[PDB]
Structure formats: structure tokens, C-alpha cells
Curated annotation (Swiss-Prot):
Disease with which this protein is associated in UniProt: Birbeck granule deficiency: A condition characterized by the absence of Birbeck granules in epidermal Langerhans cells. Despite the lack of Birbeck granules, Langerhans cells are present in normal numbers and have normal morphologic characteristics and antigen-presenting capacity.
Tissues where the protein occurs: Exclusively expressed by Langerhans cells. Expressed in astrocytoma and malignant ependymoma, but not in normal brain tissues.
Name of encoding gene: CD207
Disulfide bonds: C26-C122, C98-C114
Protein name as it appears in the record: C-type lectin domain family 4 member K
The C-type lectin domain, residue ranges: 5-123
Quaternary structure and partners: Homotrimer.
Lineage: Eukaryota, Metazoa, Chordata, Craniata, Vertebrata
Organism of derivation: Homo sapiens (Human)
Domain remark text: The C-type lectin domain mediates dual recognition of both sulfated and mannosylated glycans.
Domain of life assignment: Eukaryota
Length: 128
């Protein structure tokens, strides 16, 4: 069921999990919760998500609580500004340290509590 896009395969889960249990599942399939590094990747992801909410690889790192990608793609604050839902990340209840794709729009991301269960998206490189 992996879907192909620009050199990567993507798994849109059928079972919901917490952010970390989702990441573990991804790692057990030689992948990671997905990073997003271009408008075209954001578009592919939210369109395929079809209006449902999916964990992606957004999580906090460092003392500052800077956003980061679990697959170790460097997080680009400037280039990623356009990808958040206006008002996010809002850190609601001061307990939102993971990120999902929520709205079917380029402005898609929301921060939400890591212990909440959602469907999730894994990303796995194709290596010829
Ligand atoms: C359920 C909850 O929804 C969001 O937090 C809401 C918040 O949502 C609005 O405002 C934020 C910025 O604070 C964003 O612009 C959203 O797009 C808006 O919909 C507000 O409704 C306030 C009002 O008291 O409540 C918050 O809980 C979201 O950020 C949370 O993660 C969570 O999903
Ligand atoms: Ca939020």
C-alpha cells in the first residue's frame, strides 16, 4: 500500500497510534514519520490524506523547543512558515510537542499532544 512520490515511498496508516508508537512502527518498516521539504510534497501529502488527520515527523528538540524532523532532515523555519495552520503552532495547553497534517491545504500543520492517537504517515527512501 506504499505510495510513490519523488524518490520516496509513503505509508498512510489504517490504524491510529500515539506519535511515538507510530514512529516505532515506521522504524520497524525501515522508515520514519514523514518529513516535508517542499510545496509539492506538502501538496502530495495533504491531498492523499483526503481530509483526515495524520501524524507526521514533526517533534520538538533542544532546550528552546525548536521544531525538528525525526528523520533528521534539518528543520527550515523560514521555508516551513507557509506550512502551518494560521495560529499554529499554538502549543495549546502547553503540551503540544508533536505535529500532524490536519487541514487539507498548504497551510496544513497543527501541533498536538504526542500522546493523542492519530493515523500516521511513514516515509521510506527508494534506493536503486
Ligand atoms: C482542538 C484544538 O484546536 C486548536 O486550538 C484551539 C484554537 O484553535 C484556533 O486558534 C488557533 C491559534 O491559537 C489556530 O488559529 C486554529 O486554527 C484556530 O482554530 C482556538 O480555538 C482556542 C480557543 O480557545 O482553543 C484552542 O484549543 C489546535 O491548535 C489544538 O492543537 C487543538 O487541536
Ligand atoms: Ca495546536
Amino acid at each position: 500500500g506504499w505510495k510513490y512520490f519523488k524518490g520516496n515511498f509513503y505509508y498512510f496508516s489504517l490504524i491510529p497510534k500515539t506519535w511515538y508508537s507510530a514512529e516505532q512502527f515506521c522504524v520497524s518498516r525501515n522508515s520514519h514519520l514523514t518529513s516535508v521539504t517542499s510545496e509539492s510534497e506538502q501538496e502530495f501529502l495533504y491531498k492523499t490524506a483526503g481530509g483526515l488527520i495524520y501524524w507526521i515527523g514533526l517533534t520538538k528538540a533542544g532546550m528552546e523547543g525548536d521544531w525538528s524532523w525525526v528523520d533528521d532532515t534539518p528543520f527550515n523555519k523560514v521555508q516551513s512558515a507557509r506550512f502551518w495552520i494560521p495560529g499554529e503552532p499554538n502549543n495549546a495547553g502547553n503540551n503540544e510537542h508533536c505535529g500532524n497534517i490536519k487541514a487539507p491545504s498548504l497551510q496544513a500543520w497543527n501541533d498536538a499532544p504526542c500522546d493523542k492517537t492519530f493515523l500516521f504517515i511513514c516515509k521510506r527512501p527508494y534506493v536503486p
